[PDB]
Amino acid sequence: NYTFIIAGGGISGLTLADRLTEDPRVTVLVIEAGPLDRGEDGILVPGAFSPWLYFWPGLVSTPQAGLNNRTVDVITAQVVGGGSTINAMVYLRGDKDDYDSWGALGNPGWSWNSMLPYFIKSETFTPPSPELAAAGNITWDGSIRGRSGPVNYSYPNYFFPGSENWWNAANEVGLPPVKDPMAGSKQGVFWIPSAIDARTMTRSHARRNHYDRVSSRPNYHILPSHLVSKILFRGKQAIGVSYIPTSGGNTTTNVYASKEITLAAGGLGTPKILQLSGIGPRKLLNELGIPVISDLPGVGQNLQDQPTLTIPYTFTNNVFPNTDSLTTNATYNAEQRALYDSSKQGAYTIVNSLSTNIGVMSLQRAAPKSYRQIIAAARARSASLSLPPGTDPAVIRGYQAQRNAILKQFENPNVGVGTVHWGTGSSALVYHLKPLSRGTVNIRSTNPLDAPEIDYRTGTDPIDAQVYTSLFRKNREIFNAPSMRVLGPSEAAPFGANLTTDEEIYAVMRELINPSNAHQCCTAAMMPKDMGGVVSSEQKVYGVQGLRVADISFWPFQLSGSPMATAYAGAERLADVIKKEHRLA
Ligand SMILES: Cc1cc2c(cc1C)N(C[C@H](O)[C@H](O)[C@H](O)COP(=O)(O)OP(=O)(O)OC[C@H]1O[C@@H](n3cnc4c(N)ncnc43)[C@H](O)[C@@H]1O)c1[nH]c(=O)[nH]c(=O)c1N2
Ligand SMILES: *[C@@H]1O[C@H](CO)[C@@H](O[C@@H]2O[C@H](CO)[C@@H](O)[C@H](O)[C@H]2NC(C)=O)[C@H](O)[C@H]1NC(C)=O
Ligand SMILES: Cn1cccc1CNCCc1c[nH]c2ccccc12
Ligand SMILES: Cn1cccc1CNCCc1c[nH]c2ccccc12
Ligand SMILES: *[C@@H]1O[C@H](CO)[C@@H](O)[C@H](O)[C@H]1NC(C)=O
Ligand SMILES: *[C@@H]1O[C@H](CO)[C@@H](O)[C@H](O)[C@H]1NC(C)=O
Ligand SMILES: *[C@@H]1O[C@H](CO)[C@@H](O)[C@H](O)[C@H]1NC(C)=O
Ligand SMILES: [Mg+2]
Ligand SMILES: [Mg+2]
Numbered sequence: 001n002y003t004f005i006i007a008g009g010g011i012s013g014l015t016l017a018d019r020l021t022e023d024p025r026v027t028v029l030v031i032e033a034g035p036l037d038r039g040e041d042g043i044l045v046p047g048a049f050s051p052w053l054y055f056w057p058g059l060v061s062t063p064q065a066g067l068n069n070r071t072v073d074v075i076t077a078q079v080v081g082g083g084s085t086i087n088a089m090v091y092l093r094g095d096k097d098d099y100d101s102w103g104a105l106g107n108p109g110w111s112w113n114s115m116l117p118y119f120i121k122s123e124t125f126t127p128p129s130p131e132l133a134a135a136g137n138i139t140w141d142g143s144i145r146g147r148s149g150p151v152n153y154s155y156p157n158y159f160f161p162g163s164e165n166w167w168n169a170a171n172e173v174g175l176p177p178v179k180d181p182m183a184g185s186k187q188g189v190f191w192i193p194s195a196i197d198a199r200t201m202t203r204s205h206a207r208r209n210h211y212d213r214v215s216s217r218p219n220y221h222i223l224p225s226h227l228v229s230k231i232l233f234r235g236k237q238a239i240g241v242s243y244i245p246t247s248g249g250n251t252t253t254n255v256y257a258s259k260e261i262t263l264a265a266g267g268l269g270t271p272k273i274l275q276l277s278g279i280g281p282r283k284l285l286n287e288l289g290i291p292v293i294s295d296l297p298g299v300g301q302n303l304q305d306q307p308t309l310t311i312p313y314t315f316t317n318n319v320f321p322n323t324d325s326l327t328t329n330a331t332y333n334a335e336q337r338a339l340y341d342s343s344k345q346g347a348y349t350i351v352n353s354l355s356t357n358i359g360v361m362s363l364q365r366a367a368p369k370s371y372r373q374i375i376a377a378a379r380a381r382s383a384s385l386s387l388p389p390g391t392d393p394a395v396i397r398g399y400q401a402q403r404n405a406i407l408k409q410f411e412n413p414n415v416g417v418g419t420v421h422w423g424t425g426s427s428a429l430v431y432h433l434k435p436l437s438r439g440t441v442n443i444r445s446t447n448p449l450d451a452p453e454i455d456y457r458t459g460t461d462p463i464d465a466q467v468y469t470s471l472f473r474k475n476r477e478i479f480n481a482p483s484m485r486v487l488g489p490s491e492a493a494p495f496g497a498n499l500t501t502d503e504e505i506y507a508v509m510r511e512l513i514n515p516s517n518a519h520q521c522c523t524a525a526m527m528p529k530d531m532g533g534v535v536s537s538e539q540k541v542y543g544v545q546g547l548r549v550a551d552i553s554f555w556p557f558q559l560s561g562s563p564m565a566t567a568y569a570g571a572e573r574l575a576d577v578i579k580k581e582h583r584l585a
Contacts, residue, residue: 002029002221004578005241005257006264007228007273010082011567012551012574013264014210015122018150019575021220023585029221029255031228033246033269034079037207043085044202046156046194047326047340047348051086054079059268059451061515066437066459068510074454075518076268078246080224081207083266083518087564088351089195089203090358091153093119094559094566095415096184101405102556105398106528107537112184118569118576119182120146126154126198136356137167138191141180150213151568152197152204156349159356161319162424162487167357169481170420173474174368175359185414186560189359194351195564201344206568229448231261231277231547233293238547248449259582260546263553264571267520268441270553271300272452274524274534275443279541281392288446294543297392298532300452302399303439303523304558305516307432307458307468309509311475311495314426316488323353324425355423359478360416360433360560363409367470374470375410378403378436378463386436386461395532398525399438402557406434409560416560418471420478430475431517432468433560436461439515441523456515468513469506519563524553538577550574 004020006013009032017028034054037043042050059074079085096112103110125145128138136159167189171177176188197204214220223243230242232254240256263270274280278293280300285292325332326347340348350356364371383400384391409415419431439457444450459465479489491497494512499505526549527533529542535554541547552567559566578584 001256001258002027003257003259004028004262005255006030006262006550007241008032008082008263008265008269008551009080009211009222009224010077010264010266010551011084011206011564012082012571013262014081014206015568015571016262016264016550016575016578017220018210018214019572020578020584021214021217023579024219026584027219027221029223031223031226031241031243032080033225033227034077035224036080037085043205045340045348046089046196046201046203046351047336049088049352054086059454062453062455064456064458064515066457066510067513067515070511072515074268075516076266076520080211080222081205083567084195084205084564085207087518088354090562091193091195091565092186092561093182093184094561095186097409097412097415098559101409102526104405105401105556106531107526109537115569115573116144118572119565120144121149122146122565122568122572123149123151123153126152128155129157132157136191137177139177139179141183144180144183150209151195152209153193153195154198155191155194156196156356157201157344158346158349160322160347160424162322163355163357165319165483165487166355166422166424166478168483169478170359172481172483173477174365175361181360186360186416187362187365187414189357191356192354192358196349201340201349227448228265228273229276231273231279232256233544236293236544238544244448257546260548260578262548262550263524264550266551267303267523267553268452268454270549270551271441271523272443274299274541276446276448279544284442288443290446294541296529296534296542297395298398298525298527298534300441300523301395301438301532302525303441303454303456304435304521305456305458306519306558306562307435308514308517309430309468309472309512311428311430312426312492313428313479313489314492315490318487321347322424323347323350323355326352353423353425355421359420361418361420361474362413362415363417363467363470364413366418366474370470371410374463374466375407377466378407378410381463386438392532394530398527398531398533401527401531403436406436406557409434417467418474420471420475428475428479430468430471432464432471434467434558435464437464458513458515459510465506465509468509469502472505472509517562519558521552521555521563522557524549525556526554527556539574548574548578
């Protein structure tokens with residue numbers, strides 16, 4: 001009755017819905033758990049950034065065994081536009097070998113070269129002004145940035161003066177300027193590309209660039225505030241879905257698609273839809289009494305995120321203004337907001353608490369004297385030790401293949417494993433990009449309103465702590481370099497210069513690391529079925545027809561970088577794949 005139904009209206013879902021409805025004879029229904037955002041300042045204006053407005057409620061982890069059994073709040077979006085509506089707008093591609101690796105795992109048609117036309121098609125880059133480029137060391141390669149696609153991205157039109165100290169200090173400790181971190185490599189420091197529309201200096205989220213932009217189309221239907229609770233089958237053909245009010249009224253509705261159902265419900269939502277619908281590990285489905293439609297042990301396995309560490313600092317001589325001027329100086333805040341309201345200049349074009357530059361580093365850039373020892377320990381250890389005993393052997397094989405790919409990335413000088421950032425205020429950020437740990441997301445019941453069990457298993461693979469500790473020490477080098485030392489920084493408790501051994505440093509880290517940057521992925525992974533995969537290289541769920549996974553649940557493993565740009569470009573690629581099979585215009 002509709003041509004396609006898309007479960008979830010986040011980055012992937014709206015991108016696909018937009019491209020599919022380019023054909024007037026194709027109708028699409030997008031069912032999205034959250035509401036339409038209201039254009040409020042906390043969404044549209046970078047300096048007013050209020051992500052908590054649309055956090056999915058009531059998600060907590062299990063006790064995290066690698067993190068002193070801490071339990072954490074789980075953060076993921078529940079709103080039209082998905083993560084793009086509430087994210088920090090950091091817009092970065094992965095490195096070349098991220099995509100080549102995915103190909104090499106048994107995914108034909110996947111590589112950096114085949115993703116690049118979709119990176120370019122997805123976006124419009126707007127250059128900064130020349131005085132800001134020159135004063136800020138902003139550089140890019142226009143040949144590999146898109147000029148005509150829907151996602152607008154650019155930069156803030158302002159930087160805090162402390163960001164200069166950090167840039168030079170990063171340079172002094174071996175993180176050089178990167179010509180363009182969108183070119184497939186990002187070893188060193190560079191300006192963060194920001195998913196902002198430069199004509200108004202406001203967020204360019206998928207609600208706007210892949211729904212509002214084309215909302216006059218009568219064939220592009222949206223239904224906010226409803227949950228897809230089940231896929232409906234005729235035999236092994238996915239023919240429709242059931243949905244309920246997100247607010248949990250006792251009502252259920254069935255709707256039907258004439259070609260395909262697409263899952264786009266995110267790393268933490270798509271596996272739950274599959275499992276509720278009989279697609280997942282038969283042991284789980286059997287104990288819940290769910291008839292097995294397709295026995296896929298990979299469903300809900302292989303969860304990954306990019307762990308984060310916030311390090312507190314004090315300063316004897318920080319420079320003014322800085323980002324914390326916005327919270328501690330009511331006059332400075334008022335004058336910056338007035339500046340933004342009048343001529344759209346100033347601090348409010350930067351996402352609140354962030355700065356303008358950032359650094360990414362390979363394992364050997366982070367640990368030049370000991371990276372070979374970390375690789376040896378990771379190579380020596382059987383991949384199966386990172387998974388609970390009795391993990392399905394096919395899942396174990398797929399993880400083994402991921403792990404071998406990542407160990408070659410550890411050896412590669414041009415693939416990132418970590419990110420460092422200083423917002424110019426009282427804390428720095430260190431991101432662990434490529435954990436070897438793997439978690440799980442599993443339904444607890446047949447009740448579609450029940451949260452799944454979410455176990456990140458952060459730090460369970462002991463190599464991760466070795467990588468992360470090195471990332472910590474490189475951040476410490478930045479702050480001790482000459483250009484930062486003029487600002488007189490010192491680590492505050494619970495860190496501090498008196499922690500000098502790995503054990504001392506990681507003990508604190510074990511208490512402070514957050515499992516998650518809200519980058520949850522890889523829980524319906526695109527790997528061969530005998531490697532524990534859930535979707536083919538065309539993103540079709542094994543064992544059933546007319547059913548695909550579009551959201552980043554399908555990624556084999558995490559990028560050298562944050563996921564947003566690839567979430568867009570991957571849905572761009574899938575839209576073409578689907579149009580080809582069904583002869584769509
Ligand atoms: C606070 C915060 C901050 C950041 C980020 C996330 C968050 C939450 N990210 C992560 C990035 O935004 C994220 O990985 C992508 O948005 C995920 O894209 P998907 O399309 O896979 O899911 P996404 O999460 O965008 O969409 C999934 C959608 O499905 C809906 N849904 C789930 N279950 C459903 C069901 N049963 N029925 C219907 N709808 C359902 C949800 O409501 C949601 O809107 C990020 N990335 C980056 O590159 N740079 C950044 O700065 C940040 N920062
Ligand atoms: C954001 O991206 C879109 C897509 O490229 C840009 O929209 C185009 O802008 C020009 C001039 O405004 C028009 O002539 C085109 O028709 C627009 N639509 C397209 C190409 O689809 C928009 O300008 C971008 N924002 C900025 C600041 O450059
Ligand atoms: C991707 N990236 C790179 C530099 C800075 C970033 C963004 N990371 C933090 C985004 C964020 C803001 N509030 C949150 C609450 C929970 C989880 C994450 C967040
Ligand atoms: C992205 N791409 C690559 C080559 C061609 C395209 C454009 N999409 C092709 C879709 C298609 C396949 N068979 C058809 C028959 C009639 C109309 C359209 C089609
Ligand atoms: C976490 O809990 C388990 C029991 O479930 C226990 O074996 C372990 O010692 C605990 N870890 C810490 C750091 O307390
Ligand atoms: C830009 O780079 C030069 C050296 O090339 C450095 O002196 C200057 O401080 C840098 N400025 C910023 C804002 O990074
Ligand atoms: C607060 O900000 C105002 C406005 O820019 C500035 O003039 C003043 O020096 C600042 N005061 C302090 C104590 O930072
Ligand atoms: Mg210009
Ligand atoms: Mg005005």
